[PDB]
Design a protein around this ligand. Structure first.
Ligand SMILES: CCOP(=O)(COc1ccc(C[C@H](NC(=O)O[C@H]2CO[C@H]3OCC[C@H]32)[C@H](O)CN(CC(C)C)S(=O)(=O)c2ccc([C@H](C)O)cc2)cc1)OCC
Lengths: 99, 99
């Protein structure tokens, strides 16, 4: 689909078998989701945003379906203010900016 | 044009008579620019994201040119780590997400 930006580009995602809402975020290198339970191993990681750094849990090679498009990649889980889909997965679903 | 997301969507902007590099950021409601001493009145504001909040100065009705496309709107100035073009201006240049 084509998504305009008059509203926040929020979409429904499916991860770990559960539905959530997430923001398509071209300014994010990586994908960061609010605190949740995901199966499998994970490693601690740090990520920095506009206000500083936070501790996240890094889950690699995670299946995630974004607006009907499948991706398999890295998902960071931690105290982000909002579920954000970053470029690591936006590229997988073929997302581009156009103007 | 069409901008793929393999790398950060960085573009040249013109503001306050100066050229700068800025990120086309669909995850940003508003536009946040590096410290610059723009003329005119402003009001203080707090904006937050990953890692907490920072203090910025809000200027209204500021003209920005983004890849040759002109836009006019609110710009927040402060110690942001990167220049962020948000939806308030991205809409004005007809920017969409597409997949
Ligand atoms: C020298 C390098 O600096 P740095 O590493 C941080 O640099 C960056 C800082 C911020 C961004 C943009 C930001 N992206 C990330 O947070 O992405 C995270 C995850 O993926 C990683 O890639 C990039 C960073 C990591 C979002 O797109 C937009 N945000 C909102 C989302 C969170 C809802 S927002 O910015 O908070 C924000 C909030 C309110 C408003 C107005 C008020 O509406 C405008 C903008 C990009 C790079 O230093 C660390 C201290």
């Amino acid at each position: 689909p084509q998504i305009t930006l008059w509203k926040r580009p929020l979409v429904t995602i499916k991860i770990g078998g559960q539905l959530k809402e997430a923001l398509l975020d071209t300014g994010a290198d990586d994908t960061v989701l609010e605190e949740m339970n995901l199966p499998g191993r994970w490693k601690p990681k740090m990520i920095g945003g506009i206000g500083g750094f936070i501790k996240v849990r890094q889950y690699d090679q995670i299946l995630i379906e974004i607006c009907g498009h499948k991706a398999i990649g890295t998902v960071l889980v931690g105290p982000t203010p909002v579920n954000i889909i970053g470029r690591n997965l936006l590229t997988q679903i073929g997302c581009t900016l156009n103007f």
